[PDB]
């Protein structure tokens, strides 16, 4: 099914009220003016966006003769069988006028007869063209026939057939307001707890389509029924005094024929949040990275860097309305640079984790291909996924190998990759909701057109920690793997740690722990915990890795 | 079949309890609330990981109408034959609801319609889409239909087909615990399985079945003993290889061995001991020394003791002349090492592979370095991949390559000066069976790989003329 | 045009060359002007080339096709040149149409011996489509690039891309018009905007830097709101960009075109 079963599409239902309902339920008006109002409507959009449910919701709402046709069902075995099935559909609609034909997945049979060269396929296309002309000429001026078609690939339709649809309706991915309405319609015949806030559910499903939101409701329902399954397994365990999951299957198998009743429950808002995490949206099946486990508790010091990233990326993602009032575009470009081992990837994996947005990580020249146009197509496809799943974070690690500066000797295979990113970051097409982070050791090797506002306008420098900064880092590293706190300050402030980066401090802790094992073995052949004497052992055998910090401080 | 026949998938067996068992067996609760719980599950992973058996085991454990369908079984010759075979499968399940459809090898028929321009193939995809929607719409409330599918390459599926599977399960490569469980699941109806589990890295469930069959077959050539499995394991190879070079094969090199016994060998045999003290292993170790000192041999010894696979790269062998192919070869080494965990990646002559990213280094030589920088970030720690460098020019490598967390620690493999030569020659001769005093003066005459070639070259003169001491002086004047 | 501040010289050239003949082709036909224009916008990045080419596409009220650099390239032998030929077929069938090539130096590189053979066929395909045997009347072509010298010299001739319009860094007086345009399209008054835009700290700022300067001013406003909100809520507001917030942005934002003469040539 009914009109209630389709939600989140109000513009579409507004247009279809005068393009499907009026031709069918307003036959008297058309006959008075002597006008044949036979219409053809083509629904298209991403898969799972409720194209098939919309057609059947309208079909039951209007209450006229409905002819639902699936495209593969037409095809027959003999020569004229396939075309006669199409001819029977349109002739039946004319005989049953007013009528509504729904050609589901019409692109299966209405493909381009140019490329799809055969004998039956061309005659199938020509039969639909002939069929769609009879309906608007054989109907008796009082009853109209409306043809509804749905397809995921409108570009695969033959232009002779696509042009016969007067109306094309695009049903894109739902917005936050639409996703809330879809959830309410899906969670309408179910029993819910009053704690459930659909605004929270809508905002935590960025790139979800109507089918994905159905899986969240489907997963939440099974979540509420888990209490009646664990309790049922406990009943089975009361008769039988191989792992844990295998016992559950065998115990339920041993009963099987036993009939039990499940008490009715109410889905809790806590269960809904668990369901969202379980459900992977169809837009994130391919091309997306996993959210890093790094948090701000893993990053020591870097308060200046943390504040910039919070204001530029984490802020607008979590409070888009607050940043919109002051007039800040929901898109940021940040370039992290500095000597190696100072925490660029670490501080970029913490922003991706603490912002709760989607994450795509690019590993240097990962998108490059040897074929012409395939290297650029990957970049263009990269920003398509990041836009449909907005908000999304694109992390270009070691980006200097992907966007070298376009000199007079940069060839053209790599210069075309730069120009693709120039248009994707700041061109004609919108990229709002995409936040870009770049990490590199050689920012001077990046093209200047990349490093301008609107693409990567903000540059943050992550350099060698100071004497007081190494104290925070060493404590952060040590507390994540467990000496006291007073000795850590002494070790970190020692002049033998001058020039140590954040990686060297991690190497110092590793070297100090290795000395503990050597100490333990000596104290065993004649509860391992790092002692102060172990630290002094590593303070002599560990040297800084960045031997020439001036090579990276000037860029 | 039974549940016991499939093991090592405890996570999978518990997820499918609420996704396959509940919609089918527990359909009485769905009717009470009026909720069509028609579910679709996709199982993907490496070949021979029990995907086919898992569907059949769950089929008998529920007790519903099971329809086993393979994708090639529905493809026809005429036009409407192929689509009607698929259409009949879904129509039967609706009439047999509750039912469990299993579409094995679904990627054969459900491939992308973008690349597939064939008319029938496009209509096959559209027939599966229509079929799965009928199940979601044309079934009674108390009777639900669950569609199972298996594919080796889930990315080959059409996105419209793939979105209709709410649950995807990645039955990946078994781990040491999983392989131990797999062995205990096949040999239960016939021994320290921990040693067997750790000695077979990279093996899959089907590979472990051949080992069980090999041990059973070898036990009938004469109850199965433990030593039979050790012989049977080497007979069946997975469908790289653990080196057979022990430290007995290596002469001298005690200081070098001690460092590796704590850097690489240490946190493999006893991962918990090094975990308690916070010893997180880095990406790996850079072995620097003059050529011919057995740097490749040392790495093979480390993998043998650690019982981890060994992969060797000769350096400039990866340097392709195309744009993204030199970097793709590097990115493919770490993809195979991930599936072969634990594994050791050995880069011989790495100086010419990742030089310093100077201000004048073109661009192709800098993309390879940036490929290794982003690949060494997923090496070590909690992955099982270890990278060993090998170069006689340690100062020609980029600084970022040798930072901590990457190949930072440097170990010098010393040249045999006086007594290492004696130890090497005795070790070499122990594998080709004179006494030992004769073997000393040969090695005491005034590198390390020269002695190995000298011994076999000196053995050529013996064949031309049993090995005698007098046959070594003639070979000392023709081996350099 | 309300989004484009300054650039009066560029706006006048684009109205006489594209918007003029599209709206009233009868007037331009009498004087003898063909219904086809080729424009090459070039200059330092961030100075408004793509912005001014989106106003022309919108003010002319004609059909619009936008090309994102080397978007037409394909791995197969003939499929990249076929896309170019098909591009001008759709434009010709729906004339008047505006074809915009953003970052065009990646699609028409200068033909040399070192140039790839596959990328030299695309250049020669565009040479025939822009000015060959067939007519492209009703097709107006706009190109935007930072490196006009990397474009093939045959493409940059009358009949293919006749006129080159330089879109350079704004002057001190122009930065006032741009900053007011950016501010009023996103919501301080106008007297303070003149002081902010004329400040010596804004020397060398482009249109993208003024927009970045305004963004850094809004972030300074939010920091001020954050600190003051806690003080007046725990112990005891309206986010508006004040003149004190502009002071923080001026000390934070630096120009992006560090070598203006690299593009001015």
């Amino acid at each position: 099914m009914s009109i209630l079963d389709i939600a989140g599409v109000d513009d579409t239902l507004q247009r279809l009220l005068k393009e499907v309902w009026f031709p069918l339920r307003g036959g008297e008006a058309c006959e008075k003016m002597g006008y044949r109002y036979d219409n053809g409507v083509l629904l298209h959009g991403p898969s799972g966006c409720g194209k098939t449910t919309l057609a059947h919701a309208i079909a039951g709402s209007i209450g006229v003769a409905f002819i639902p046709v699936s495209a593969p069902s037409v095809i027959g075995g003999t020569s004229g069988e396939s075309e006669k099935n199409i001819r029977d559909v349109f002739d039946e609609a004319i005989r049953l006028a007013p009528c509504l034909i729904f050609l589901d997945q019409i692109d299966a049979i209405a493909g381009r007869r140019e490329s799809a060269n055969k004998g039956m396929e061309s005659r199938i296309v020509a039969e639909i063209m002939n069929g769609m002309d009879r309906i608007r000429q054989n109907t008796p001026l009082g009853k109209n026939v409306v043809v509804l078609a749905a397809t995921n690939r409108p570009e695969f339709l033959d232009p002779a057939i696509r042009r016969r649809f007067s109306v094309e309706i695009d049903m894109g991915m739902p917005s936050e307001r639409a996703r809330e309405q879809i959830l309410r319609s899906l969670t309408r015949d179910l029993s819910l707890a009053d704690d459930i806030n659909f605004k929270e559910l809508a905002k935590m499903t960025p790139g979800y389509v109507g089918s994905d939101l159905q899986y969240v409701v489907k997963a939440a329902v099974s979540e509420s029924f888990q209490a009646n399954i664990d309790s049922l397994l406990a009943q089975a365990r009361a008769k039988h005094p191989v792992s844990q999951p295998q016992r559950d299957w065998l115990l339920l198998e041993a009963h099987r024929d036993e009939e039990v009743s499940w008490p009715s429950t109410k889905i809790t808002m806590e269960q809904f949040r668990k369901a969202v995490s379980l459900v992977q949206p169809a837009s994130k099946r391919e091309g997306f990275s996993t959210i890093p486990d790094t948090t701000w508790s893993h990053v020591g010091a870097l308060e200046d860097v943390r504040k910039k990233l919070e204001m530029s990326i984490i802020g607008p993602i979590k409070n888009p309305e607050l940043f919109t009032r002051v007039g800040i575009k929901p898109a940021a470009g940040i370039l992290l640079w500095g000597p190696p081992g100072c925490g660029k990837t670490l501080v970029a994996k913490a922003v991706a984790n603490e912002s709760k947005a989607n994450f795509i990580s690019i590993k240097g020249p990962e998108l490059l291909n040897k074929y012409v146009g395939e290297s650029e197509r990957a970049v263009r496809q990269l920003f398509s996924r990041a836009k449909s799943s907005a908000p999304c974070i694109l992390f270009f690690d070691q980006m200097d190998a992907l966007v070298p500066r376009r000199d007079d000797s940069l060839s053209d295979a790599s210069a075309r990759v730069v120009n693709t990113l120039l248009t994707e970051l700041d061109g004609v097409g919108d990229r709002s909701g995409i936040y870009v982070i770049g990490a590199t050791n050689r920012p001077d090797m990046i093209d200047e057109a990349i490093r301008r506002p609107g693409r990567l306008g903000t540059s943050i420098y992550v350099g060698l920690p100071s004497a007081e900064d190494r104290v925070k880092i060493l404590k952060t590293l040590y507390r994540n793997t467990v000496t006291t706190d007073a000795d850590l300050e002494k070790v970190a402030l020692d002049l033998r740690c001058t020039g140590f980066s954040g990686a060297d401090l991690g190497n110092l802790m590793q070297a100090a722990a290795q000395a503990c094992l050597e100490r333990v073995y000596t104290q065993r052949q004649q509860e391992p915990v790092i002692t102060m004497e172990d630290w002094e052992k590593a303070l002599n055998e560990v040297k800084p890795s960045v031997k020439d910090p001036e090579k990276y401080m000037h860029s | 079949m039974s549940i016991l026949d499939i093991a090592g998938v405890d996570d999978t067996l518990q997820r499918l309890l609420k996704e396959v068992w509940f919609p089918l067996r527990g359909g009485e609760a769905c009717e009470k609330m009026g909720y069509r719980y028609d579910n679709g599950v996709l199982l993907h992973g490496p070949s021979g990981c029990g995907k086919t058996t898992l569907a059949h085991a769950i089929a008998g454990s529920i007790g519903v109408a099971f329809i086993p369908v393979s994708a090639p079984s529905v493809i026809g010759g005429t036009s409407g034959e192929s689509e009607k075979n698929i259409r009949d499968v879904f129509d039967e399940a609706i009439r047999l609801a509750p039912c469990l459809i299993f579409l094995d090898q679904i990627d054969a028929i459900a491939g992308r319609r973008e690349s597939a321009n064939k008319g029938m193939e496009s209509r096959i995809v559209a027939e599966i889409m229509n079929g799965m929607d009928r199940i979601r719409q044309n079934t009674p409330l108390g009777k639900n239909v669950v569609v199972l599918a298996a594919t080796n390459r889930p990315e080959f599926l059409d996105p419209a087909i793939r979105r209709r599977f709410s649950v995807e399960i990645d039955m990946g490569m078994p781990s040491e615990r999983a392989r131990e469980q797999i062995l205990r699941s096949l040999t239960r109806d016939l021994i320290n399985f921990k040693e067997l589990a750790k000695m077979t890295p990279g093996y899959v469930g089907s590979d472990l079945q051949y080992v069980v069959k090999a041990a059973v077959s070898e036990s009938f050539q004469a109850k199965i003993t433990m030593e039979q499995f050790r012989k049977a394991v080497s007979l069946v190879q997975p469908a790289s290889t653990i080196p057979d070079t022990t430290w007995s094969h290596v002469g001298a090199l005690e200081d070098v061995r001690k460092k590796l016994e704590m850097s690489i060998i240490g946190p493999i045999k006893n991962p918990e001991l090094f975990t308690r003290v916070g010893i997180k292993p880095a990406a790996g170790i850079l072995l620097w020394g003059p050529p011919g000192c057995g740097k490749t041999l040392v790495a093979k010894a480390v993998a043998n003791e650690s019982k981890a696979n060994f992969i060797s790269i000769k350096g400039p062998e990866l340097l392709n002349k195309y744009v993204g192919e030199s970097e793709r070869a590097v990115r493919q080494l770490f993809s195979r090492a991930k599936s072969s965990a634990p594994c050791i990646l050995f880069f011989d002559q790495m100086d010419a592979l990742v030089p310093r990213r100077d201000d004048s280094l073109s661009d192709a030589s800098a993309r390879v370095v940036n490929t290794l920088l982003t690949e060494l970030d997923g090496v070590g720690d909690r992955s099982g991949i270890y990278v060993i460098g090998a170069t006689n020019r340690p100062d020609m490598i980029d600084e970022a390559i040798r930072r901590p967390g990457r190949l930072g620690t440097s170990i010098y493999v010393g040249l045999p000066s006086a007594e290492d030569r004696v130890k090497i020659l005795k070790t070499l001769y122990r594998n080709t069976v004179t006494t030992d005093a004769d073997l000393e003066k040969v090695a005491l005459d005034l590198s390390g790989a020269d002695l190995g070639n000298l011994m076999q070259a000196a053995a050529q003169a013996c064949l031309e003329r049993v090995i005698t001491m007098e046959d070594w002086e003639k070979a000392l004047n023709e081996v350099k | 045009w309300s989004h484009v501040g300054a650039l009066e010289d560029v706006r006048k050239k684009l109205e006489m060359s594209i918007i003029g003949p599209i709206k009233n082709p009868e007037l331009f036909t009498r004087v003898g002007i063909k219904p086809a224009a080729g424009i090459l916008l070039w200059g330092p990045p961030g100075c408004g080339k793509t912005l001014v080419a989106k106003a022309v596409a919108n003010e002319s009220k004609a059909n619009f096709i936008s090309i994102k650099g080397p978007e037409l390239l394909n791995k197969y032998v003939g499929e990249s040149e076929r896309a170019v030929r098909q591009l001008f077929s759709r434009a010709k069938s729906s004339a008047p149409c505006i074809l915009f090539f953003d970052q065009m130096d990646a699609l028409v590189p200068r033909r040399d011996d070192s140039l790839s053979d596959a990328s030299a066929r695309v250049v020669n395909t565009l040479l025939t489509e822009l000015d060959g045997v067939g007519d492209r009347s009703g097709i107006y072509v706009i190109g935007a690039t930072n490196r006009p010298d990397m474009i093939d010299e045959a493409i940059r001739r009358p009949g293919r891309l006749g006129t080159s319009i330089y879109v350079g860094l704004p002057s001190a007086e122009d930065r006032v018009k741009i900053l007011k345009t950016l501010y009023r399209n996103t919501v301080t008054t106008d007297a303070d905007l003149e002081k902010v835009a004329l400040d010596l700290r804004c020397t060398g700022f482009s249109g993208a830097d003024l927009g970045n300067l305004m963004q850094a001013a809004a972030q300074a406003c939010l920091e001020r709101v954050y600190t003051q909100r806690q003080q007046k809520r725990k112990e005891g507001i309206e986010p508006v960009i004040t003149m004190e917030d502009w002071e923080k942005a001026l000390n934070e934002v630096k120009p992006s075109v560090k070598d203006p003469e690299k593009y001015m040539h």
Partner: peptide, 24 residues
């Protein structure tokens, strides 16, 4: 018996040409 005209499939499998890229 009646002889019928039936629609069938084909193998085809055309081979396509490709363009590559080289380094400096």
């Amino acid at each position: 018996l009646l002889l019928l005209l039936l629609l069938l499939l084909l193998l085809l499998l055309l081979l396509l040409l490709l363009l590559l890229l080289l380094l400096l």
